[model samples]
Target: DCGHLHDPCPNDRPGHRTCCIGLQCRYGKCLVR
Candidate 1:
């Protein structure tokens, strides 16, 4: 899920960014684009 999952960091920090584009987390799982 490398390409599917984002780096979650633009500059590098907690709560920066996560989840796949046009996707959402479901049942503790993330749906990647």
Candidate 2:
């Protein structure tokens, strides 16, 4: 969960696939939920 709300979602990181529990990965960033 590296990318939290409005955080950058980099595909080069290990935790890139997971976003803060309720957040979604879109536009290379994590969306707030």
Candidate 3:
């Protein structure tokens, strides 16, 4: 299953929704999400 994390900012804003396609992040790490 895919996991997604929503940004506190409004959806209309840029990059509001980030999703985890297949990996996870730890401390400022940049993944597909």
Top candidate when judged by lDDT against the true structure: 2
TM per candidate comes to 0.33, 0.56, 0.21
Backbone clash total for model 1 is: 0
lDDT of 2 by residue, 1-33 (tens): 255678777773564565777877777777975
Count of clashing residue pairs in every prediction: 0, 0, 0
lDDT of each: 0.42, 0.68, 0.35
**Residue 24 lDDT, candidate 3, scale 0-100:** 40
**What is the descending lDDT order?**
2, 1, 3
How well is each residue in 1-33 modelled by candidate 3, as lDDT tens digits?
Answer: 223443221232233323344534434342443
Q: Return the clash pairs for model 3, or none.
A: none
Model 3 TM-score, all chains together: 0.21
Report the error of model 2 at residue 13, Å: 8.6
- Worst 10-residue lDDT window for candidate 2 reads 9-18
Top-TM-score structure, candidate number: 2
